Amino acid sequence: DPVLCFTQYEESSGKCKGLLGGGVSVEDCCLNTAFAYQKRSGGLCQPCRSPRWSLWSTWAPCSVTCSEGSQLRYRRCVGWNGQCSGKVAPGTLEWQLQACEDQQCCPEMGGWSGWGPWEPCSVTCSKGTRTRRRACNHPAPKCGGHCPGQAQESEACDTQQVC
Amino acid sequence: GVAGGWGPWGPVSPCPVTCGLGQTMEQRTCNHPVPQHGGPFCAGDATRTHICNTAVPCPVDGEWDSWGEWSPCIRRNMKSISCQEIPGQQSRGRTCRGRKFDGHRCAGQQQDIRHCYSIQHCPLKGSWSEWSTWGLCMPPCGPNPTRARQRLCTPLLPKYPPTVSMVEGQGEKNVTFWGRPLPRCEELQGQKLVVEEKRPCLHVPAC
Ligand SMILES: *[C@@H]1O[C@H](CO)[C@@H](O[C@@H]2O[C@H](CO)[C@@H](O[C@@H]3O[C@H](CO)[C@@H](O)[C@H](O[C@H]4O[C@H](CO)[C@@H](O)[C@H](O)[C@@H]4O)[C@@H]3O)[C@H](O)[C@H]2NC(C)=O)[C@H](O)[C@H]1NC(C)=O
Ligand SMILES: *[C@@H]1O[C@@H](C)[C@@H](O)[C@@H](O[C@@H]2O[C@H](CO)[C@@H](O)[C@H](O)[C@H]2O)[C@@H]1O
Ligand SMILES: *[C@@H]1O[C@@H](C)[C@@H](O)[C@@H](O[C@@H]2O[C@H](CO)[C@@H](O)[C@H](O)[C@H]2O)[C@@H]1O
Ligand SMILES: *[C@@H]1O[C@@H](C)[C@@H](O)[C@@H](O[C@@H]2O[C@H](CO)[C@@H](O)[C@H](O)[C@H]2O)[C@@H]1O
Ligand SMILES: *[C@H]1O[C@H](CO)[C@@H](O)[C@H](O)[C@@H]1O
Ligand SMILES: *[C@H]1O[C@H](CO)[C@@H](O)[C@H](O)[C@@H]1O
Ligand SMILES: *[C@H]1O[C@H](CO)[C@@H](O)[C@H](O)[C@@H]1O
Ligand SMILES: *[C@H]1O[C@H](CO)[C@@H](O)[C@H](O)[C@@H]1O
Numbered sequence: 206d207p208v209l210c211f212t213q214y215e216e217s218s219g220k221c222k223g224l225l226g227g228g229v230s231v232e233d234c235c236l237n238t239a240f241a242y243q244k245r246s247g248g249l250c251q252p253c254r255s256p257r258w259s260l261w262s263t264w265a266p267c268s269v270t271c272s273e274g275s276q277l278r279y280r281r282c283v284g285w286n287g288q289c290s291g292k293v294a295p296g297t298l299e300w301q302l303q304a305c306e307d308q309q310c311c312p313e314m315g316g317w318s319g320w321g322p323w324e325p326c327s328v329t330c331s332k333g334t335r336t337r338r339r340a341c342n343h344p345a346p347k348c349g350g351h352c353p354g355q356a357q358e359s360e361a362c363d364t365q366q367v368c
Numbered sequence: 369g370v371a372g373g374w375g376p377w378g379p380v381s382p383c384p385v386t387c388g389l390g391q392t393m394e395q396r397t398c399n400h401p402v403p404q405h406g407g408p409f410c411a412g413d414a415t416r417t418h419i420c421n422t423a424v425p426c427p428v429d430g431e432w433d434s435w436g437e438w439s440p441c442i443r444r445n446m447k448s449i450s451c452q453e454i455p456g457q458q459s460r461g462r463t464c465r466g467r468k469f470d471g472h473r474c475a476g477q478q479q480d481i482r483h484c485y486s487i488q489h490c491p492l493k494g495s496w497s498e499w500s501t502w503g504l505c506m507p508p509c510g511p512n513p514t515r516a517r518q519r520l521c522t523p524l525l526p527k528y529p530p531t532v533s534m535v536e537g538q539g540e541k542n543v544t545f546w547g548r549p550l551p552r553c554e555e556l557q558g559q560k561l562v563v564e565e566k567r568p569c570l571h572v573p574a575c
């Protein structure tokens with residue numbers, strides 16, 4: 206089966222670097238064990254060395270941002286014409302599952318409460334301002350989160366009185 | 369404005385490798401008709417990088433296998449040396465695997481020998497260790513993974529001399545304990561050897 210043949214296997218990245226040519230068979234390109242091959246050009250860059258386990262990848266992100274979660278990491282048996290340690294065919298993945306914990310703070314954002322009553326106008330003659338205030342405590346915000354919006358609103362009041 | 373065409377599918381470079389595959393080149397350089405003064409250019413495909421095929425496989429250097437299992441710790445003409453103050457010897461083996469086609473051999477010693485005391489199947493006093501670090505979720509990607517930490521009954525090794533002298537030379541060597549003993553301890557939560565605790569893993573992702 207004709208497969209694209211590369212000239213150098215960059216280890217620790219899994220990338221096929223330095224292209225030699227295409228259409229050559231797998232038995233001919235792997236006569237030099239420092240080469241690498243790639244079928245269909247959609248992935249799976251395999252070195253011409255004997256089948257040994259590759260390096261473990263870095264841990265996947267924690268499945269939840271709060272409390273105890275779980276994270277994965279994979280390892281691919283890279284190589285040709287041989288079996289990895291454990292009667293394992295080439296191309297098979299192996300995963301490891303570990304519980305993580307990103308932080309110990311949870312629902313940091315808070316919602317608004319019921320609005321308080323309207324205060325009277327700030328002046329008894331001419332014009333002034335009028336203000337309502339509410340609380341951010343149903344539920345209360347945790348950590349450095351804040352309630353969305355403004356904590357108070359203001360509008361004008363006309364008293365219809367000459368000073 | 370000199371009109372440039374193509375020369376030969378040119379003279380071959382020799383195959384630059386004595387093994388496997390290589391890349392020769394000829395191309396077709398624009399040399400027999402050269403474009404001058406920046407007029408037209410050579411039209412077509414100048415690319416030839418050719419895969420030359422040598423029918424000899426290249427040498428591959430052999431790599432070391434993992435270290436084997438330690439042999440039983442005995443001494444010649446000393447019956448069984450278990451649970452005694454008799455120093456013995458033990459061995460371990462490796463395997464140079466993968467050297468073909470006149471490749472380089474493995475660099476290093478294939479056998480590892482150390483001096484030992486035999487503690488195989490000996491009753492000892494013990495003490496309970498603390499809670500170990502929480503293990504991985506087993507089985508991963510399967511039905512219901514669970515964690516595992518444990519307190520095991522660690523044996524108290526006897527205070528033997530840590531070195532031994534040699535007959536031929538005055539320089540001394542290390543002694544290292546080997547064996548699977550049977551530790552004796554008080555019970556914790558209804559077990560005599562090891563007490564563990566399992567907790568299931570939360571938010572298991574698809575693999
Ligand atoms: C038999 O086995 C023992 C181990 O059970 C082995 O002991 C080895 O001792 C050396 C030297 O003490 C250790 O090397 C050390 O490495 C650490 C860093 O990992 C350094 O910090 C140490 O430096 C300090 O200690 C020296 C004396 O101990 C001082 O001279 C120095 O100034 C520092 O204070 C030191 O370099 C080594 O880790 C152990 N363990 C091994 C090799 O597993 C002993 O050598 C063995 N005997 C034989 C004959 O093989
Ligand atoms: C990651 O960041 C956290 C701070 C939360 O905002 C997470 O949102 C959700 O919070 C609930 C708790 O009510 C958890 O069940 C989940 O972790 C998550 O769905 C966010 O994903
Ligand atoms: C409310 O009733 C009005 C009739 C005034 O008597 C007010 O007093 C006035 O307050 C403003 C500012 O608050 C001052 O500028 C005036 O000097 C003062 O007469 C009263 O508060
Ligand atoms: C031709 O004969 C072969 C038997 C080998 O001895 C070849 O040596 C090779 O040279 C290349 C450098 O280009 C190395 O990568 C190889 O490791 C080596 O086998 C020789 O050229
Ligand atoms: C993955 O597992 C460990 C890394 O923690 C090593 O033994 C090795 O790198 C393997 O690929
Ligand atoms: C996964 O675990 C941590 C990241 O959470 C690091 O020690 C490292 O990146 C490892 O791959
Ligand atoms: C203030 O505004 C009106 C009364 O003027 C009502 O909608 C309500 O009592 C609010 O507190
Ligand atoms: C045996 O010795 C150590 C492990 O004890 C490593 O250098 C390696 O795994 C070798 O096979």
Ligand SMILES: *[C@H]1O[C@H](CO)[C@@H](O)[C@H](O)[C@@H]1O
Pocket residue numbers: 436437438545546547
């Ligand atoms: C021999 O040494 C110890 C057992 O005492 C282990 O690391 C292993 O079993 C090795 O083969």
Ligand SMILES: *[C@H]1O[C@H](CO)[C@@H](O)[C@H](O)[C@@H]1O
Pocket residue numbers: 494495496497553554555556557
């Ligand atoms: C472990 O077992 C008991 C605790 O239940 C004690 O006698 C002692 O700490 C031992 O190591």
